[PDB]
């Protein structure tokens, strides 16, 4: 049993809710919150901008030190950093950004990072300002992630359509 409340069971291991990932993280304090990161860990907008703002920019400060030491991530890759006031850890995962012309096939590799964690609070990878189809992202999630994932969806109208179109 875990403390994720009001989620909708989609499969054995994937659950979904119309909710602000910032609020879910603050309420649940999950072991892992997933950030929709880019390879430079520049948390300017979308989920990343919102999570970083909620940490009062501490996420960005930590991220800048990480990049200065290690260099950029790979598209499809990830790193584990602090969850600050949101979670124990933040798993920064880089889905392909279609608005930058990146290969959508890398979306499955991006979701494979979730399998290294037994339970996660997460956004749909490559959705929103990343420019991929959220219905496609949900399908790849369900077909790739085997650990227990709680997906928070900011947009109410998108949530309604993700539920009604899910196979
Ligand atoms: O600012 C915040 N939260 C905050 C939460 C999510 C987002 C965000 O970018 N959502 C995206 C969106 C929007 C529309 C369609 C989409 O496919 C997507 C994908 C993605 C998502 O839903 O995962 C931005 C901000 N909270 C402060 C306290 C009030």
From Swiss-Prot:
Q: Summarize the activity regulation.
A: Inhibited in vitro by GRL-0617.
Q: What is the effect of changing residue 164 to L?
A: In strain: Gamma/P.1
Q: Which reaction does it catalyse?
A: Thiol-dependent hydrolysis of ester, thioester, amide, peptide and isopeptide bonds formed by the C-terminal Gly of ubiquitin (a 76-residue protein attached to proteins as an intracellular targeting signal)
Record note on what altering residue 31 to A does: In strain: Mu/B.1.621
Give all residue intervals belonging to the Macro domain: 1-167
Hey, what's the signal peptide range on this chain? none
Where in or outside the cell it occurs: the entry states: Host endoplasmic reticulum membrane
The task this protein performs is described as: Responsible for the cleavages located at the N-terminus of the replicase polyprotein. Participates together with nsp4 in the assembly of virally-induced cytoplasmic double-membrane vesicles necessary for viral replication. Antagonizes innate immune induction of type I interferon by blocking the phosphorylation, dimerization and subsequent nuclear translocation of host IRF3. Also prevents host NF-kappa-B signaling. In addition, PL-PRO possesses a deubiquitinating/deISGylating activity and processes both 'Lys-48'- and 'Lys-63'-linked polyubiquitin chains from cellular substrates.
Could you describe the subunit structure of this protein?
May form homohexamers. Interacts with N protein.
- Tell me what this protein is called: Papain-like protease nsp3
Q: To which species is this protein native?
A: Severe acute respiratory syndrome coronavirus 2
């Amino acid at each position: 049993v875990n403390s994720f409340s009001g989620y909708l069971k989609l499969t054995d291991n994937v659950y979904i809710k119309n909710a602000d990932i910032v609020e879910e993280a603050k309420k649940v304090k999950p072991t892992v919150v997933v950030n929709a990161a880019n390879v430079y860990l520049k948390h300017g907008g979308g989920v990343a901008g919102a999570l970083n703002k909620a940490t009062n920019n501490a996420m960005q400060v930590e991220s800048d030190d990480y990049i200065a030491t290690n260099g950029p991530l790979k598209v499809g890759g990830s790193c584990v950093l602090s969850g600050h006031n949101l979670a124990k850890h933040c798993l920064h995962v880089v889905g392909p950004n279609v608005n930058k012309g990146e290969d959508i096939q890398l979306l499955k590799s991006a979701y494979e990072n979730f399998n290294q964690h037994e339970v996660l609070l997460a956004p749909l990878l490559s959705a929103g300002i990343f420019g991929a189809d959220p219905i496609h992202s949900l399908r790849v999630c369900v077909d790739t992630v085997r650990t227990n994932v709680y997906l928070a969806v900011f947009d109410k109208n998108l949530y309604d359509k993700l539920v009604s179109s899910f196979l």
